[PDB]
Symmetry: C3
Subunit: 138 residues, 3 copies
């Protein structure tokens, strides 16, 4: 079970055509044709404190998952299925919107987000994923 | 014709009285009496990539233009008419909410936003302008 | 009387359990047990210009004060009482949502936000305080 305790981090990806124009703050873009399985999207920093004896976890917003997939979502509820992996090779489990660390205790590092399955038929626009910090108990 | 492809950048101006207090992050402010033709408001970064053969463009939100003017808007739909100019002297055309580059191809730089006509009669408040990246076809 | 003129600064504090996980952009967290009187929460920059003859001022959102207290507020309407103090020792007055400088004129500095009274029973979540610039007549 996830218990919320911590802050929420936003990850944004804008799906574009091959010609694209970035305006203002620099944020990630990928052309439709580049939405292939395992394509890197972004990284999010994660730091777990005061967690001796407990397993660090992230929870996706309910706008970002269903029973089978984690996904970034557009303003029109278009969905880009994605997957999470810690960059340090540490062991985590994903299911039902929760990404939780196998070994307990403090940890700091980064979680990579990548495309989960070929999705070149998805539309252009801004997609967002919110992940909230907390811990997992059994 | 504007084809959406790219990200959106927001530009903000707070119109104030002569005595004004900036709280938090530093942002652009102008007293009502300083809303004179050609007064600089801000600049926004713009980068066109993958655009061989195509003209870079920006599109304003529908509640940032009308048939004659581009404008920043307050929460009460007050309109501060503004104009756009690439800071490197490159040639662009403005019409009907679209700012599009004359020469096709990749380009990066900045677009300056300035007051378009003396407007010292406009009220205090926060005014915003959103510009979305894409390209122009004929 | 407060007259609005200037910008708004948001200050956020996330109240956590003892084990907590910070994700993405760094913002302030404190565990419930750390909500002790005088605990530092944050600082906010404040710059007054064009204010010859007028006193610089901040106004809290209506959701952020009552006759007795200034407070950060959660989306569940929980209240964390806080207090303001300029970091340079300058003299300001707080009352009924307005923090205004005793000496008129231009000034640039920072205002510290701290916990006002022991409040270790407050619930977890994101608490916000919005302060808007202006001047006092």
């Amino acid at each position: 079970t996830f218990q919320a305790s911590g802050t929420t981090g936003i990850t944004t990806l804008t799906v574009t055509e091959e010609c694209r124009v970035q305006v203002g703050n620099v944020t990630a873009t990928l052309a439709r044709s580049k939405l292939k399985d395992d394509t890197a999207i972004g990284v999010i920093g994660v730091t777990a404190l005061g967690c001796n004896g407990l397993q660090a976890a992230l929870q996706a917003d309910p706008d970002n998952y269903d029973a089978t997939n984690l996904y970034m979502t557009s303003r029109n509820h278009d969905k880009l299925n994605v997957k999470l992996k810690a960059t340090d090779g540490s062991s985590w489990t994903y299911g039902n919107g929760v990404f939780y660390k196998t070994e307990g205790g403090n940890w700091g590092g980064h979680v990579g987000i990548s495309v989960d399955g070929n999705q070149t038929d998805k539309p252009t626009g801004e997609y967002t994923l919110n992940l909230t910090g907390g811990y997992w108990t059994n």
